[PDB]
Structures are given as structure tokens and as C-alpha cells.
């Protein structure tokens, strides 16, 4: 029952046993490059509950994202419009930083299918995410029908469409009274369907 102890030991990361080694490696992740292949998951508890297994065809990268919101990419901060859009320097980029990590990990490796990712560190400038990848044409993934959904061509590039766990949290979708700004499919399929004029044939 080891992975029950790895989980509960991880849910206390302000304790001095746990915040020691969580920044003796945040030092060590900051001495490496931007995207870097891990040889193995640094936390096998959270990795395998997100769909990892220890077999040939699963591959882990840790990639580094720079923290903070977005500055509006506009020359000398002059946006030229009505005053409600002078927003250069307090703007926040409605997709999360983990979804940025899943994307450029999957943008570099195009032959790889990204399952999802998790958190392994942050310091002040950088935030660190291990991104778990799936090789769809390995015969340990191409066989085993528990995994053959991702070797099927509609699952190409799930972050550039926002289909992972970190991706679909920004889309605001869900069942309930808090979430019917996307009541058919997505935000802009609800938009098109309430803003179309359905003038019938006998009207």
C-alpha cells in the first residue's frame, strides 16, 4: 500500500521534510534547459493516476514556464482605441500556465500524443510541470485496446484544441447552472446557436 503513503506525504508540502526536497530539486530543475526529457516520473503516485504505466511507449518531459500574466504586445504601450482597452499591464491570459506547459511539450514532439501533466515545482520566476507523452506507433501502445483510443487520428494534438485535463478547465464547460455560457458543446457553439436567426419555412 505504498502509493497511499506517497500521496498523503505529498499533501503536506509546507512541512520541513517536504519543503526541503521540493526546493533542492527546484534548484536542480532550474539548472537544466527549457524542455528536458525525464528518464522516469519524479512522482510515480500522481503520474499513474493520470494514466501513466511503466511500459515502453510512455515518455516524460519536464518543461519550464515563466510565471505571471501577459503584457499586451503593443508598441510603447499605446493601444489607440477607446479607453476601455488601454489595458497594457494588468492582463491575465485566460488559459492556465499548465496548459501552456502541455502545449509546447507537445509542440516540440509532434510524433507524440500528450495524455496530461502535473505539477512538480515553482520558485518565483519559473513553474515546473512534468508532461507525460504517449508514442502512438509503438507496438505496446498500438496493441492493448485499453490504450488504442489515442492512436486514432482525431486525437492528434490535444492541446492545440484544449482537450486534456489542463486544457478543458479553461473552456469553462460543465453541467450545471454555473456553466450554461457553454450549453451546447463549447462557448462559441452556444454563441452561434443563440445568435442565429432560425426563420423557418412556414413562418
Amino acid at each position: 500500500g505504498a502509493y497511499k503513503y506517497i500521496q498523503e506525504l505529498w499533501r503536506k508540502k509546507q512541512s520541513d521534510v517536504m519543503r526541503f526536497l521540493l526546493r533542492v530539486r527546484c534548484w536542480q530543475y532550474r539548472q537544466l534547459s527549457a524542455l528536458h526529457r525525464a528518464p522516469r516520473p519524479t512522482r510515480p503516485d500522481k503520474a499513474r493516476r493520470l494514466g501513466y504505466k511503466a511500459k515502453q511507449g510512455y515518455v516524460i518531459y519536464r518543461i519550464r514556464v515563466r510565471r505571471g500574466g501577459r503584457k499586451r504586445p503593443v508598441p510603447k504601450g499605446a493601444t489607440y482605441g477607446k479607453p476601455v482597452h488601454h489595458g497594457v499591464n494588468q492582463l491575465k491570459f485566460a488559459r492556465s500556465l499548465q496548459s501552456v506547459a502541455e502545449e509546447r511539450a507537445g509542440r516540440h514532439c509532434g510524433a507524440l500524443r500528450v495524455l496530461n501533466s502535473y505539477w512538480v515545482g515553482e520558485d518565483s520566476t519559473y513553474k515546473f510541470f512534468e508532461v507525460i507523452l504517449i508514442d502512438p506507433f509503438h507496438k505496446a501502445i498500438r496493441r492493448n485496446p485499453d490504450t488504442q483510443w489515442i492512436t486514432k487520428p482525431v486525437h492528434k494534438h490535444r492541446e492545440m484544441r484544449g482537450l486534456t485535463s489542463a486544457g478543458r478547465k479553461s473552456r469553462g464547460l460543465g453541467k450545471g447552472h454555473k456553466f450554461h455560457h457553454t450549453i451546447g458543446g463549447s462557448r462559441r457553439a452556444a454563441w452561434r446557436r443563440r445568435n442565429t436567426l432560425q426563420l423557418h419555412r412556414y413562418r
Binding site: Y5, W10, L21, P44
Partner: peptide
């Protein structure tokens, strides 16, 4: 990672 082992 020591957390695999440190409880035991």
C-alpha cells in the same frame, strides 16, 4: 525521489 521510501 526519497518520498518513495521515507515513510517506511
Amino acid at each position: 525521489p526519497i518520498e518513495l521510501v521515507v515513510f517506511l
